Homo-oligomer: A and B are copies of this chain.
Amino acid sequence: VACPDGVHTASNAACCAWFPVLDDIQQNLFHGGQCGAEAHEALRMVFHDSIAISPKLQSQGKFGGGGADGSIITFSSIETTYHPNIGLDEVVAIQKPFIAKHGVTPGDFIAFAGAVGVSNCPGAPQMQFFLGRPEATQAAPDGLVPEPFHTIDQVLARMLDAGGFDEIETVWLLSAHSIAAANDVDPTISGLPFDSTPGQFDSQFFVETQLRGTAFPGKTGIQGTVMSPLKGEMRLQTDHLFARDSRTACEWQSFVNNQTKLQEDFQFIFTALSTLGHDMNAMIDCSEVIPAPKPVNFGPSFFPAGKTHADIEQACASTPFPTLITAPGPSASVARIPPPPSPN
């Protein structure tokens, strides 16, 4: 169908209005389509907005939250005070102007920006975008977003309540930490990545969390973190535990050297996550507006410079960690990703 603008075409008229939002954010939020601080922040926003849903609280007569309803923006003055949501007050502040200019809901904007932000990362899957998330009525309660100091059992339970995500699917979701940094965990350094390739959607996160830890990247012993294997890299205690837990270890290892599996799983689970609190069959598929992802321009998984197969703590009992190629050069260090400055 021809859009009213005379310029675009869409298989559903409701999709028309997203073309202008795409051009605006590619240019002004992601600074020319980068997989940078803003793209990583857009993906974290999808998770903090979406997982705040609890059939278990609902069943007890309590509001368990609306899932993917943009409540983190509409009710940011409540929701960004929660400890799991640290730093999102500034992310809301960067995203607000775009929502206002385009007259779209905060919920649909979050899912759209998260999908477009991921597509800018080499190795990303083709991302989907389902449309139809009315404004939130109420703020989600606290206690719904997982913390890096929670036990594996506590995280697995929350995930299963929120969305019926088992432990296999939870491992797939954590693929998101392959394009991510920590700005607010270590008070002395902001922008410490979780893998040595925060600008690439790959399996380095799955390789590097399996290495033995040798030091804290900044301030020593922060709760929710453990020693990481590389200077400049942060390791969260949960990611450390998932890589070594008997229920999840082999799934964790399965992404090592399997970019195809990584893409397929994440493409699926991201659609599941972004539509929590809604009926997908009642939403409009505007996936056609999301651009083709940046192509892979990297080889197979590797051991960072200075590390060998001997540095691997094997945890998958049925399958031994593969013997990967070591990167060239001097012992690896990871460069920081400085966060955006306050607003515009």
Report A's interface with B, CB cutoff 8 A.
31-32, 122-123, 196-197, 257-260, 294-302, 304-305, 324-330, 332-335, 338
Closest to A324 in B: B299
- Determine which residue in A302, A324, A328, A334 has the highest number of CB atoms from chain B within 10 A of its CB, and name it: A328
B334 with A295: CB separation less than 8 A:
yes
Closest CB-CB distance, A193 to chain B, in whole Å? Answer: 10
Main secondary structure, interface of A, reads: loop
In whole angstroms, what is the CA distance A6 to B110 when docked?
A: 46
Q: Which chain B positions have C-beta within 8 A of A324?
A: 299
Check A335/B298 contact, CB under 8 A, given A259-B328, A260-B328, A329-B260.
no
User: Which of the residues B196, B298, B304, B328 comes within 8 Å of A327, measured between beta carbons?
Assistant: B298
Q: Which chain B positions have C-beta within 8 A of A330?
A: 296
Closest CB-CB distance, A132 to chain B, in whole Å? Answer: 31
**24 A-B contact pairs sorted by A residue (CB < 8 Å):** A122-B335, A196-B295, A196-B297, A257-B328, A258-B328, A259-B328, A295-B332, A295-B333, A295-B334, A296-B329, A296-B330, A297-B304, A298-B299, A298-B327, A299-B299, A299-B300, A299-B301, A299-B325, A299-B327, A299-B328, A300-B302, A300-B327, A300-B328, A325-B325
Copies of this chain: 2
Closest CB-CB distance, A47 to chain B, in whole Å? Answer: 25
Q: Which chain B positions have C-beta within 8 A of A326?
A: 299
A297 with B328: CB separation less than 8 A:
no
In whole angstroms, what is the CA distance A32 to B297 when docked?
A: 22
Q: Which chain B positions have C-beta within 8 A of A305?
A: 296
Sorted nearest first, the 8 A-B pairs with minimum C-beta distance are: A299-B302, A259-B328, A296-B329, A196-B297, A299-B327, A295-B333, A299-B299, A299-B325
Closest CB-CB distance, A64 to chain B, in whole Å? Answer: 40
Q: Which chain B positions have C-beta within 8 A of A333?
A: 295
Closest to A340 in B: B32
Closest to A331 in B: B295
In whole angstroms, what is the CA distance A305 to B296 when docked?
A: 8
B259 with A329: CB separation less than 8 A:
yes
Closest CB-CB distance, A122 to chain B, in whole Å? Answer: 8
Closest CB-CB distance, A293 to chain B, in whole Å? Answer: 10
Q: Which chain B positions have C-beta within 8 A of A123?
A: 329
Closest CB-CB distance, A57 to chain B, in whole Å? Answer: 42
A335 with B295: CB separation less than 8 A:
yes
User: Which of the residues B197, B257, B325, B335 comes within 8 Å of A300, measured between beta carbons?
Assistant: B325
A334 with B297: CB separation less than 8 A:
yes
In whole angstroms, what is the CA distance A258 to B328 when docked?
A: 8
